Design a protein around this nucleic acid. Structure first.
Lengths: 65, 442, 32
RNA sequence: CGUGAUGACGAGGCACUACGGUGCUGAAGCAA
RNA sequence: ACAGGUUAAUAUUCCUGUA
RNA sequence: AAAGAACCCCGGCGAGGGGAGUGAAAA
RNA sequence: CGGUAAGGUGAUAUGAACCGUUAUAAC
């Protein structure tokens, strides 16, 4: 029983911290955007490489199917 | 005693204690990446050029691509890991890894099973009618190639894992999703065009651009996190000098937010992956234990209630269906998450050492930094949630990320975005370790 | 570490993979 | 002396543990 | 303004019970 | 003119020192 | 209020953040 209570409390106590941790720039007129940048940049490379390697052929497999 | 005999027969990868330059870890990774994409271009040798649509549900988490030399993809490896976490998780086979024994036991063992699940899935796939023509002869041939391709990955993972950057799996998944996006949106039968063309044709189709939006929205959302750092610290430290770089210092932060539960959810989604597969499989090859599929996927049964709704647009026409899934996923997440504890996870024990040195100590001077050295409980406490939180947090997000639905896979995009960032970090911790040949633990 | 009594150098797995490709890449396509 | 207090504390046990130590419980608890 | 209790370090100052 | 000696070695992640470079010169 | 100006936020004092390059930078 108690176990559930503590678990429920921890979640609440955490939600409180999230309130204190923000000010800065919520988080910063450069931070957030960063993640999206690096993240998108990375996905672009992996995605681009797949396209160059992908499609390219599909044109042959179909033109010779 | 253990399955050590055949276990010792299962090859491994020669890890050189030599100099593996950043440039080389990089160039290595890349070679793996391509052999992957490439294998995803090659169809499996099979006269029956006719295949029954596809399983729009397994590909994403599996990083596979049905009909190709990797039609099974990471699927096995994940399955395997799933069981282990299940056994070694629900105590069923209690193990205290600590010793290099249990550690290398849990591992080596799982690895094997991965090859077991490698073939099983193969057979199960064809047996689920993934290709249409069950020519016992031809069927056999296929299975061969199939599971053998997945094998190559298992070893390609090993390579990356000890010769390059990031992780095979992690990579692979991101590899697939990214492509699935760049191609789906811009490739041959690309959507951006189908939409663009539809505009020119004069009959603006909101259904061609739709899925593309779905993906932006998700990406933006999924990203939300990994930014809730928390500028803090800090300590004091001391030591010379000094002209420019001298005055004592320490370490800053914060670091980020999310990830940890990266492998956990990969397993939850993967569980469902082996259900829709295992149900259809044990459908057109037996009794409707799990559910009545028909039409390819499932339209009733455990299977039905446990089939992710995404693809193009969110389905409202079945509220209850939504509710269950969500809750179903949520809990499954909690699970593998807990099973990740009994095993291992973002630990304070480990952060202790390293958050108790940043500064000095030493003899020369009086640089402070008491920290620290007995004040860890402050982490395990503030910690718990961090990763999480979870089976509803991440798991929730992931799920809702699917209702919304997006290209590549709402959930897939998620993992990807994460994997990609944890992959950026990897590229930095490296760009630096390529200077001070020592601090390979700070 | 690993109890794998056998050691395999990556250069191999890579080349072994270039194998699967060539085989099926021609075993299938290039019909006749 | 009542009450404060069918409360607390409390020898000792059932637990984890880094080995600094920490939780659950709990007898008697009066008189000359 | 007393008796318990508590901090690595405070104490008829903090917590409790009772003034 | 700080270019105030990267990096390597002994030594107690010492003291001190030997190389290596900076410098016209580290006489 | 006047001069002056591509440079500045006194020193040990670096860094950090900023202010200015044309007439409310600074002196």
């Amino acid at each position: 029983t108690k176990g559930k209570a503590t678990v429920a409390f921890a979640r609440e106590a955490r939600t409180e911290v999230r309130k204190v941790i923000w000010p800065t720039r919520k988080p910063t007129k450069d931070e957030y955007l960063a993640v999206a940048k690096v993240t998108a940049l990375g996905i672009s490379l992996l995605g681009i490489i797949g396209y160059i390697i992908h499609v390219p052929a599909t044109y042959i497999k179909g033109i010779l199917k | 005693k253990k399955l050590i005999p055949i276990l010792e027969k299962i090859p491994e990868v020669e890890l050189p204690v030599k100099e593996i330059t950043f440039k080389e870890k990089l160039k290595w990774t890349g070679i793996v990446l391509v052999l992957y994409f490439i294998m995803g271009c090659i169809d499996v040798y099979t006269a029956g050029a006719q295949i029954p649509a596809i399983f729009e549900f397994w590909q994403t988490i599996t990083a596979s691509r049905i009909g190709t030399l990797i039609t099974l993809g990471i699927g096995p490896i994940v399955t395997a890991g799933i069981i282990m976490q299940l056994l070694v998780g629900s105590g069923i086979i209690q193990m205290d890894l600590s010793i290099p024994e249990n550690r290398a036991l849990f591992q080596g063992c799982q690895k094997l099973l991965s090859i077991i699940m490698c073939f099983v899935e193969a057979v199960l796939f064809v047996g689920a009618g993934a290709f249409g023509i069950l020519t016992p002869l031809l069927a056999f041939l296929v299975i061969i190639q199939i599971a053998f391709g997945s094998i190559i990955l298992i070893y390609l993972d090993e390579i990356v894992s000890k010769y390059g950057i990031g992780s095979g799996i992690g990579l692979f998944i991101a590899a697939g999703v990214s492509q699935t996006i760049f191609v789906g949106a811009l490739g041959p039968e690309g959507y951006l065009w189908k939409f663009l063309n539809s505009l020119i044709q004069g009959v603006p189709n909101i259904e061609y651009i739709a899925p593309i939006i779905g993906t932006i929205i998700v990406f933006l959302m999924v990203v939300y996190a990994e930014c809730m750092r928390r500028r803090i610290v800090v300590n004091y430290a001391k030591r010379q000098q000094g002209r420019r770089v001298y005055a004592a210092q320490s370490t800053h932060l914060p670091l980020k937010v999310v990830y940890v539960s990266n492998i956990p959810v990969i397993l939850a989604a993967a569980l469902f992956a082996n259900i829709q597969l295992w149900g259809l499989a044990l459908y057109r090859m037996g009794i409707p234990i799990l559910g009545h599929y028909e039409g390819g996927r499932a339209v009733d049964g455990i299977a039905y209630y446990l089939s992710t709704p995404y693809g193009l647009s969110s389905v409202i026409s079945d509220p209850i269906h939504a509710i269950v899934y969500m809750i179903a996923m949520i809990i499954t997440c909690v699970m593998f998450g807990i099973f990740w504890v009994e095993t291992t996870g973002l630990d304070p024990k480990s952060m202790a050492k390293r958050i108790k040195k940043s500064g000095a100590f030493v003899p020369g001077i009086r640089p402070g930094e008491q920290t620290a050295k007995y004040i860890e409980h402050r982490l395990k406490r503030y910690i718990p949630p961090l990763t999480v939180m979870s089976s509803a947090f991440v798991g929730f997000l992931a799920t809702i990320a699917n209702f919304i639905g997006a290209l590549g896979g709402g959930t897939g995009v998620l993992l990807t975005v994460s994997i990609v960032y944890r992959m950026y970090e990897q590229l930095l911790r490296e760009k630096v370790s390529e200077l001070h040949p020592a601090i390979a633990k700070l | 570490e690993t109890f794998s009594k056998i050691r395999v150098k990556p250069e191999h797995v890579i080349g072994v993979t270039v194998a699967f490709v060539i085989i099926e890449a021609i075993l299938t396509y290039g019909r006749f």
